[PDB]
Amino acid sequence: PPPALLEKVFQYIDLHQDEFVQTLKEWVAIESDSVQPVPRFRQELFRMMAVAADTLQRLGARVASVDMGPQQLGQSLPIPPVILAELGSDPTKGTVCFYGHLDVQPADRGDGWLTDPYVLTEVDGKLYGRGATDNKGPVLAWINAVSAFRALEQDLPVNIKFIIEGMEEAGSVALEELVEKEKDRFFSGVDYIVISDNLWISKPAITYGTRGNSYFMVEVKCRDQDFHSGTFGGILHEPMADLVALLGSLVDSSGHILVPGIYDEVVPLTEEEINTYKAIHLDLEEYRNSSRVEKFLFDTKEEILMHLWRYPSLSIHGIEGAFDEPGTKTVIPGRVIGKFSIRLVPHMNVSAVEKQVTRHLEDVFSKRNSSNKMVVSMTLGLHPWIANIDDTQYLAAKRAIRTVFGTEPDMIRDGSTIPIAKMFQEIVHVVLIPLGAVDDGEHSQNEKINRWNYIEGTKLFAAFFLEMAQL
Ligand SMILES: [Zn+2]
Ligand SMILES: [Zn+2]
Secondary structure, eight states: OTTTTTHHHHHHHHHTHHHHHHHHHHHHTTTBSSSSSSSHHHHHHHHHHHHHHHHHHHTOOEEEEEEOOOOEOOEEEOOOOOOEEEEEHHHHHSSEEEEEEEOOOOOOOOTTOSSSTSSSSTTTEESSSSTTTIIIIHHHHHHHHHHHHHHHOOOOSSSEEEESSGGGGGGGTTTHHHHHHHTTTTTTOEEEEEEOBBBBBOOEEEEEEOOOOEEEEEEEEEEESSSTTTTTTTSSSOOHHHHHHTTTTSSSSSBEEETTTTTTTTOOOOOOHHHHHHHHHOOHHHHHHHHHOOOOOSSSSSHHHHHHHTOOOEEEEEEEEEEOOSSOOOOEEEEEEEEEEEEEOOOHHHHHOOOOOOHHHHHHHHTTTOOSEEEEEEEEEEEEEEOOTTHHHHHHHHHHHHHHHHSEEEEEEEEEEOHHHHHHHHHHHEEOOOOOOOTTOOOOOTEEHHHHHHHHHHHHHHHHHHHHOOO
């Protein structure tokens, strides 16, 4: 049983759930792809921001859609407006701000989707579609919670602010300058900030730490034109041969990173820290099963979680400029770019990591005595983020979770990076409430959010409004 007429709010959410799921279906069908520099998609992104601005206004919010200007690509594209919305300015009330994004990662059905990525399809309680979990589901769950108090003419316990952007999947272009401009304007008197764009691991969760990241591009160039692999086979220093040797020099079969210096500054594992991991709830057979992975690099819960949260990791993403379509093309690529990144943990320095990776790659390349040119560039470099657990925002969330799910949340870290979390910490001086399941498949084929997570998460947000008012 819930408290109060949270009972009535909860009743409302259960009765309007099919409507909440149809709104999500409608938002998902707007192909708000920010990553493709294609006018068709950027227009759909602007329409998305407009649909959201209208939704917030209809709820009762003062809404501003802030003109963001051009995105320099030697061409350019307009950036989608940022919604800056306020619902209530009651001086007898605290104020909570919610950040979300309504742009999505590209989705091509040919990538391996069993459904049309932009048609929300429910299969065994799972709602499949691009943006279902990342991030239209949790934005709507928050909005739908507010709309329950509004429909019932129930006083919202806190004032609510919304900051919603349309460029998160493309580096939040122009957000930081707007935030900076607004630090003592829109953010003046905002008590706590909420982000809901992350997943559980098993038991619901609250997330209080994230990894950093460093994204590397390694270009090996002969000439711009490719070669016929037979007509010119046998006589070139082939860009692909150099790149494959460069990429193959980075990590070993155990996951151990081979760049010298990389472990120098990782904080030492302590007894205390080990204990924190032992207290997390994770069935390793369950985790193997939802991931459909035969075996992981490690055998125990503690090793698995630590390698995700507090050890660095290296992933090779792909190669650009070579033969990557289906079939059997006989080509020596003239210019290729390897892509890989290293997730960063305390106490690693971004600038040192950049130096170390570069030096390593130069040393490998020079030993090849190749005629090719190599350019390493670190295109992205972010430090890790940690919240203070048992902050007032963090306690409200714990209580809200207990109310809705009837159990204590585990305090978890995250292997991914939430750059926005760091940005609000640096400029405005954040609580992460995950709604997604571990197997939601964000940034992949067959992304979903579970109906239960989406609907029960709406209730979580409702309870949370009330908890924030209570300190
Ligand atoms: Zn997201
Ligand atoms: Zn994303």
